[PDB]
Design a protein around this nucleic acid. Sequence first.
DNA 1: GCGCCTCTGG
DNA 2: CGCGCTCTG
Lengths: 67, 66, 65, 68
Amino acid sequence: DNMFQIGKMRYVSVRDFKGKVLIDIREYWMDPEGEMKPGRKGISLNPEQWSQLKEQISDIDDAVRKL
Amino acid sequence: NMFQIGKMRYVSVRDFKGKVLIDIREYWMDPEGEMKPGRKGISLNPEQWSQLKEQISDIDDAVRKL
Amino acid sequence: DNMFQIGKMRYVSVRDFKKVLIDIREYWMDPEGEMKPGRKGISLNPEQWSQLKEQISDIDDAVRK
Amino acid sequence: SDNMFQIGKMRYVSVRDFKGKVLIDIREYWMDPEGEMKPGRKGISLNPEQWSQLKEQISDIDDAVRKL
DNA sequence: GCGCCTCTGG
DNA sequence: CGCGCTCTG
Ligand code: NA
């Protein structure tokens, strides 16, 4: 579908924005109304940015284990 | 410790108060010339970065199927 | 409800949000035809609203100047 | 050289003319890591028109609070 | 929440 | 954290 859950309250969602698709990695929350709303912590990537994130996982995992 | 993914977009692996942070963030340039982290960004713990990679295929399936 | 239009799609609201607040906000249209409030707003308690009212004269001078 | 009017602990009413458009902004401020006072997300900028209609509605707004 | 300053700060 | 598609202490 649209949503792919990565944290207890964080999802990476795919969405078509007028032909241009955005890969949005965002944290969510709920208002006093009980409905789920998005938050400030997040970012929407284009496909190229998403492609360049995947080919950087090499150094990402390496940098994580070096500290 | 930073890995670029966009024009002003970088993935920084850092240590903030004992725990490791994986920050996907967009930066901005000051008038003096240096870059500062901006509002658009999120920092994942190793556990959230864990399932992000596991869901990569599902995500790539969806970006094509749209 | 007790809505008070001030602009094109901007209203002021007197609400008892669980506290009495005078909220100035911009609103938008929903695909379901309804009208929803945006995040381009601010809620003022009666204290700040009174202070706001005591300085309109000073602000009206500034806009004229 | 003085165009701001305090209404709260960190809330102010500022006025200016950004490229001919005159705005009367009511919002809350914050402090950045550079030690400077910056406007915040809680607020709204009004044109003189919306500023006039706000004043012409203060009557009913004041007694709507009293009814609550 | 998702061109350009009299702007942009995890 | 001002000038097409989301509330408030
Ligand atoms: Na920020």
